[PDB]
A paper describes a structure:
Here, we report the first functional characterization and the first crystal structure of a prokaryotic sulfatase, PsFucS1, belonging to sulfatase subfamily S1_13, able to release sulfate from fucoidan oligosaccharides. PsFucS1 was identified in the genome of a Pseudoalteromonas sp. isolated from sea cucumber gut. PsFucS1 (57 kDa) is Ca2+ dependent and has an unusually high optimal temperature (68 °C) and thermostability. Sulfatases represent a large family of enzymes that catalyze the hydrolytic cleavage of sulfate ester groups on carbohydrates (EC 3.1.6.-sulfuric ester hydrolases; EC 3.10.1.-sulfamidases) and are divided into four classes based on homology, crystal structures, and catalytic mechanism.
Numbering used by the authors:
A (entry chain C), B (entry chain A), C (entry chain B), D (entry chain D): 21 to 521
Write the structure that this text describes.
């Protein structure tokens, strides 16, 4: 009551903090841009896989860990670097959030659905992607790269709203487990066992158009083939941007790198390209080079001033596959709701629109990228009213100089378990991941109920979440955090979550 | 059943062990006293906040920890010292039990209900305090000091039965978080955050009479003000006792010290008064002096022979706020069902009724003080029959020389979680608190399910609960411990617990 | 499904993997044996209590831990040694599975029912023991030694199907706790407590015949008496084998040693007989000698060629009672679903039927001994169709040279909690036991929920379960492990488990 | 300079804090006593083995752990209770300190020297016991009970200065390891191994007069014999006190209980005499009764007012032998320099000399008992000048009302390793004992070097030494703590320590 600064706009939309003065600056910047450009703006989402908060140089990594990222760094120094961007703790949960504007517990997309899985419902028949909505108002929409949000009938991007799909229906490790003989020898060198397991082996990169069928476009059956995966994806993103711009149409492209998911096999060009001379760091060099190649293309096509570029990650680093892992200064990693698992890099670049040199610690969510995309295209009013949407339009936050965020709380779920939330700079845990083996967040952990008080970390003072102080310094704020929790869960009674059985 | 010595008297009352010979002695002592005194006895309950089992010198602390307690020692040495007195693990839960005869899971009083809380019904309408029942038979009843059992409309002591209330609706820490700027700087020196949080800042000590309005009798706006808090409470209890004795009516007074809850600020007189010269120890010297002043007042009024004095705590030491913490020799502390959290000091003094120099290890509960009080006033038959009462009348235990307890089992709850029980000298845990940071029982703990066998500690042999032996030496008793658990839970099916929503 | 090699025979029977060629060998071997022998075969089950996987010399113990086991080694080296035999984590549960062919969560026999518990219905009215079915087709069936699956009315072996019973209704520790004064002094030297606890003291060894009353055959009132317990049981098993062979009837005998359950008191002639010179190691030598005596009796009576001998254990070592404990190389022990508690020794010997010198790592369960017995006697078709049976006939697996197992999965329950399963050589934990005090698997453990991924151990590579790799090397098999788990739980939706209340 | 309040009197003597006014009171009390009594005072040292700080009732034990100690409580309540009394971590070391006035690293008496251990020189030829010095000025000196400071030639009390010795040359567990067959079966039931070990079996209690031979006065060949051990010792102290009073000579008697060292076998009449009904608690009752018997003897002979009674322990509880162990609230136990091992109970009773009801937290040491004894007998001026003496005369501390101690610092050694010191209420660790298994302070511990700062505990605020704060609050005092350490080590270069080889 005395703390809640959010206002309910539509009952099925996450309440947002009004920023009227920032909204006026945003509306004005977009009006003048479209006058000069003659059409709606493009959006380029560069989505790296399992990238940690600290991997880019501007976040305290780069040359400090043997993989300088000059292009990503330049994108940040000449734009807006978000230090409190949040994702979900796992691949599918985050990519679902980014393409539905909904916490995955609502949609049922907490785990990838396989081609032979028994489901009572295809969740995508009910969910609405930004490709669907933006397509209807003139955008050419595409997801190029990793999907991992369902590969059964009617679940690929070009089947759920996007005009064009090209990439991996599952994930890198699904391919490499049938390629690195020694690493997976218990299955690879066991003939009887390999005969069974290889029947569910992925074929390669899939290509698909809205209204058409799926096609194998780049088969993968060796390490040499898979080492070119991100080069091939880069080739398709270039062709997609060339085609959309040459046709004078606004485009919306999610470029979903395969890297740096394990097992990383960078292109031969990049073997030893990083000072560290390790596959995952070489892969980071390849990601930084492809990022620069796409920025250069837009600059050469004269569309850089009309393109919002978002560089982010889908979750924290996968320490379980060390040394094939990224780096994050925070506690934990992929598979936990510690900050290591969910606090991720987030860079917003828009030449002429977003002032250079900004570092902003305002709260932001992957679902906010979804909802900002919808507002940029002018289609927020097209969302269904019987579904609850967790995303918040952050246009006023991104386009204002040192603007304040419109999001008040970040809610954190481990699939169907609600575990923690962040309000202001305070991190409140109601369920805690406890790891038995160092680095083994996913594979050797417990999810434990807290005791008398939820764990509380002031992230400004204890960002690495080393020791909880609970109620000691937070008696004034604890009941409000509980109110945020209960209200959040209440929205899931008012709007039932999907059970896909 | 070869073990159960308890007998069902009224179906809605915790079964008690008959002590018929001790009861004859108690009936005779009470009869002769009322014939000589001319009216029912007074009861004075001295309730110290967050005092550990070993804080008083007579329990093994005092001078050993740099804070002598001579007056409290004299109460024990000239009366009865209980070494197996039990409370609830936290403030609100223990204070509800003391004023309702009921484990707080039955009443819903596991958390303090603040103003503006959503509740189906005010739990206190249904509950029956000893103030209500004793006031009905001519007692002047008062609670002076800390309440912390609800501050919304109709929840202060003068609105739930007591004739007079004077003290803190909430708790010391609620006041001090708005006074110690540096300790709470993230809120106090943040202008916008302070403006919001300070709107729920308590104004001071609240004064209230049955049938009247709440008044702010003593404002608290500085450390200087709050440093006198326990001197002001002492003054009010002196006025109350004087007024009741001058009217010739029996008094029932719960003097609920604010000390030694954090943040401790003793009166200026007591700065450096303890050899330790630390706030929490200086506060212990202040509590001991006030105890002696109240005893000396009763002596000067000629009411010591007709006054039962009970000195006790509401829970174990708050180790989380170290070094502003009491001391206990047992494991854990406040916020856990380790012995450190629930095994608390307990002294019964009654000049001419309770023989001096008794140390008794018989089981006793805070709810037993409630039920003992009701019997001394002759009002047990007034308890509603639709509610289960956990308290047991212990008058035959307190008034018998080296008497045996009427309580067979102590049941331990963490709010809505049943975690452990004690039977004879055996502590059986069905859920265990596990602490991740030293001293951080409340703020950095888990509540974990046990494995194949409940944990068992022979408290005579392992009082510090260092390592469980489970079934190894307790096969004969383990099935009975489970029978006690099952029956205890079954009473909550036959007598439903309150859901306040 | 590409992984599932099992086939549904009957809908209420655990699916098995067909082994047609092994089955032909089994059918032919049995037909020729019965031609020369003139009657169905005998089955002698030697069941040692709390014996670890590695206690026998052939399993890496014996002389290595100061207790040679030559006779048991002879059964293994002249027969078939199973290195992946599994039990339940505790006594009652395992013996229920051995005598009902059903995981104890289905029957309700997760705990011993005491003569004085009052249960909705006696589970043995519904459960079908191999004694009932085999006696119906001409077998003389007996259980001699430890029972521990209920001692209330109609729960002893001679009341639930077996023709003859002689042994302990409960367990060794139930007797020795009233005999070893010092070890149990808190109860033994406390007059009041002993008077109550000893009312439930077992009188001695109970004898019973189908259709007859219970009798106290061997009173136990001293260490002297109970030190001969396994010598008495040996004498009874000798009488029973002699009389079945003299009468020309096939016999089914479960010899259930009291050893090596605590507190071990071997016969005087074995004091110091082991090099280690400790009670539990002396008890091991006594067990080995008794094994050799029964085998010699078969050879003397000319029945060794027509007798399948199964040497196995009921659960892993009880480390909590150290140093009165067996040995196992695996993690944990009795009371946990770690391999230490469930992976147990398993030796099958059948002179002339099972080729000597075999070591086989195929999966096998105690319920498979039940189901294999029923097929050897030819009565599998007599099982009720409204009850699910987890046992699998392993006759083709035991009578084939280096044959493959018919069991695809072992399912592991901690009473009512499903915790893990084994498929192929992979151990997958869904709930993990965590021990807070070394050796204290039963008495100081937690049962914790896993985090993002189930814990996975390749037992060939990590047989001691030292650090889980989870999904890292098992992405191809993890969905199939989930399919097994969910299908297993589904069988208990279709066939309800017994709620004994 | 700024902090040191001690003064150097003789260069080979530990400096002491002058207490001139307390010394004036002490000289007057002793003068008036000797006028009325007619001779020098008696001293009775009651020394319990492995007794914890909290075991007596007045220290927070007794009835709270099921073993009341009324006679020991009465000594404290009617005398002076010391809450900061310190010993050494082990038996031999502490008993050396008590009978030499010197930290045992100086004398070489850190381990008991066994018959024929081949030493460079018997260390007792250099040390000067109070028996020797007091005997020269007319005292009858005796040690009755446990010795444990050397069994070789010339090492028993009657050979190193005491007039009379009667008791155990070694320790209780030296006898019982040859009496409890099952507990020590690896040796007892191994014929060849028992034959070897039993050649060093102690034959029983040894008796000796100054200038006479050793004699076997009570043979111990069974549990029956040893169960009376402390009754036999009580008889001898009675005979000794009677003989001294009838001869009119002042007596100095160290009554060294065998209890409560493992394995505890109390007299038959005490079996179950404690409420806990456990051997170690029954033994506590026997010790309390014998204490009361000796006090009543002195009163009956008319010497109570001329007898200083010291009740204390030689070290903390032996948790390794749990449940045959005492109790202490502090961390650790016997075998460590945690407070649990060295902070011991200490009571001083002197009817008419020491005012009743005192509790004093001043620093006190076992070596101070030695030096105080020498003062009372008037023989301090007879100490050699080539040995450094650590003991300090505390007569002014024990005979003053709430007097301050003459000891500034307590230095703590683990045999030859300097580990910690206490100054004021601050405990400073330079080496730390880390315990790998709960309770196993002696048997499963490491001795670790600290890191950048010595560990510091304010014992008033953290008496259980839960978490060190080091320099954080002690920068003003840490350089002084280091000065104390270095000066202490310097005394050992000026006065070299003994190398026994
Ligand atoms: Ca990912
Ligand atoms: Ca409290
Ligand atoms: Ca067993
Ligand atoms: Ca000792
Ligand atoms: Cl604004
Ligand atoms: Cl290349
Ligand atoms: Cl009675
Ligand atoms: Cl003041
Ligand atoms: Cl086959
Ligand atoms: Cl024998
Ligand atoms: Cl002085
Ligand atoms: Cl006796």
């Amino acid at each position: 009551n005395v703390f809640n600064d959010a206002i309910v706009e539509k009952p099925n939309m996450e309440p947002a903090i009004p920023r009227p003065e920032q909204e006026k600056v945003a509306v004005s910047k977009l009006k003048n841009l479209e006058a000069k450009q003659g059409r709606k703006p493009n959006v380029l989402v560069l989505l790296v896989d399992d990238l940690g908060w600290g991997d880019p140089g501007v976040y305290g990594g780069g040359a400090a860990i043997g993989a300088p990222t000059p292009n990503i760094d330049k994108l940040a120094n000449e734009g807006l670097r978000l230090t409190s961007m949040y994702s979900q703790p796992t691949c599918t949960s985050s990519r679902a959030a980014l393409t539905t504007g909904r916490l995955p517990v609502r949609s049922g997309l907490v785990r990838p659905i396989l081609t032979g899985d028994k489901v009572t419902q295809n969740p995508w028949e009910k969910e609405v992607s930004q490709g669907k909505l933006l397509s209807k108002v003139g955008y050419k929409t595409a997801l190029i790269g990793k999907w991992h949000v369902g590969e059964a009938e009617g679940m690929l991007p070009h089947e759920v709203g996007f005009d064009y799909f090209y990439g991996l229906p599952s994930v890198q490790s699904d391919y490499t487990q049938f390629l690195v003989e020694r690493q997976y020898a218990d299955m690879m060198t066991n003939k009887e066992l390999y005969t069974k397991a290889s029947q569910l082996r992925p074929e390669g990169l899939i290509k698909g158009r809205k209204g058409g069928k799926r096609e194998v476009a780049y088969p993968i059956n060796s390490i040499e083939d898979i080492s070119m995966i991100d080069q091939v994806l880069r080739d398709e993103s270039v062709k997609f941007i060339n085609q959309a711009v040459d046709e004078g149409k606004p485009f919306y492209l999610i470029h979903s790198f395969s890297k740096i998911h394990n097992d990383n096999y960078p292109a031969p060009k990049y073997k030893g390209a990083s000072p560290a001379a390790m596959p995952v760091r070489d892969a980071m060099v390849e990601v930084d080079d492809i990022t620069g190649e796409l920025v250069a293309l837009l600059k050469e096509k004269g569309q850089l001033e009309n393109t919002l570029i978002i560089f982010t990650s889908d979750n924290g680093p996968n320490e379980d596959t060390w040394p094939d892992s990224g780096y994050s200064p925070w506690r934990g990693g992929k598979g936990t709701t510690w900050e290591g698992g969910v606090r991720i890099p987030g860079i917003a670049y828009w030449k002429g629109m977003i002032s250079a040199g900004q570092v902003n610690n305002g709260l932001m969510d992957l679902t906010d990228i979804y909802m900002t995309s919808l507002r940029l295209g002018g289609v927020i009013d097209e969302l269904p009213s019987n579904m609850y949407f967790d995303g918040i339009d952050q246009t006023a936050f991104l386009l204002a100089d040192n603007g304040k965020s419109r999001r008040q709380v970040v809610y954190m779920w481990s699939r169907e378990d609600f575990t923690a939330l962040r309000w202001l700079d305070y991190k409140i845990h109601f369920k805690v991941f406890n790891t038995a083996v160092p680095r083994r967040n996913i594979d050797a952990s417990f999810l434990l109920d807290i005791g008398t008080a939820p764990w509380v970390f002031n992230l400004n003072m204890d960002p690495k979440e080393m020791a909880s102080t609970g109620h000691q310094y937070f008696e004034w704020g604890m009941p409000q955090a509980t109110k945020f929790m209960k209200a959040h869960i209440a929205t899931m009674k008012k709007y039932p979550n999907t059970d896909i059985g």
